[PDB]
């Protein structure tokens, strides 16, 4: 009872159709993640990715930062998250500039306009997510 078969019935492609690669759970989770979800605009993809990453980026800096044992621990963590997000979106912009040099299609992550929209969504979402995480950690007594 074989469970590892050729990828898309192609023995000569460098891949295997394992349970990890091809199972229904993997397909569902991957295809429903924002980067692969159907119908989402590049702005919406970038926005979702941005809030998801900016929400959790604050935590390492807040807990394990140099000023963890200081009254300004959370503020310093938020500023660190903002700086890291600035670096991340600068990386995104230069990546778009290097990769999608000539393009006129748009509405596609592999085009200049689409990648710019994705980066804009990522920046706004990450800033908002870091701010929301700051608010939650300030009001941690609620939970």
């Amino acid at each position: 009872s074989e469970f590892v078969k050729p990828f898309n019935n192609d023995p000569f492609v460098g891949n295997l159709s394992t349970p990890v690669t091809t199972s229904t759970a993997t397909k569902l989770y991957l295809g429903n993640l924002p980067i692969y979800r159907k119908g989402l605009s590049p702005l919406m993809r970038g926005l979702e990715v941005g809030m998801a990453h900016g929400y959790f980026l604050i935590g390492p800096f807040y807990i394990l930062g140099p000023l963890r044992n200081s009254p300004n621990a959370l503020l310093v963590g938020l500023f660190s998250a903002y700086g890291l997000i600035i670096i991340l979106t600068l990386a995104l912009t230069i990546y778009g500039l290097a990769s999608f040099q000539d393009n006129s299609t748009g509405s596609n992550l592999e085009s200049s306009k689409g990648w710019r929209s994705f980066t804009s969504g990522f920046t706004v979402g990450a800033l908002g997510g870091a701010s929301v995480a700051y608010v939650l950690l300030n009001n941690v007594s609620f939970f």
Partner: protein
């Protein structure tokens, strides 16, 4: 003075980061047509 605080991060983080970004983009620029 305050010049160390103003200048050391400016010249050792912001300027080298921008230089690395510019160099990367320039080396990745393709041939003109």
């Amino acid at each position: 003075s305050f010049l160390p605080s103003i200048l050391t991060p400016l010249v050792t983080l912001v300027f080298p980061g921008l230089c690395f970004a510019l160099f990367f983009v320039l080396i990745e620029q393709d041939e003109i047509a």
